[PDB]
């Protein structure tokens, strides 16, 4: 499964993490492909640069 970030990779391994943007696009990213750090997305509303 591929998510919608500019420079994304399709990992498809056992367990991979995703983030939803709360800045408007409501699309899913992988934490690594949209430059999210786990702590940040689980702490604050995550707003991709596209919605920023």
């Amino acid at each position: 499964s591929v998510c919608a970030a500019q420079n994304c990779q399709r990992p498809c391994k056992d367990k991979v993490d995703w983030v939803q943007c709360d800045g408007g696009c409501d699309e899913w990213f992988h934490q690594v492909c949209v430059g999210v750090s786990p702590e940040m997305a689980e702490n604050e509303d995550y707003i991709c640069i596209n919605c920023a």
Binding site: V16, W18, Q20
Partner: peptide, 9 residues
């Protein structure tokens, strides 16, 4: 945010 983890294979 809204997070998730998809488990494959």
């Amino acid at each position: 945010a809204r997070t998730k983890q998809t488990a494959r294979k």
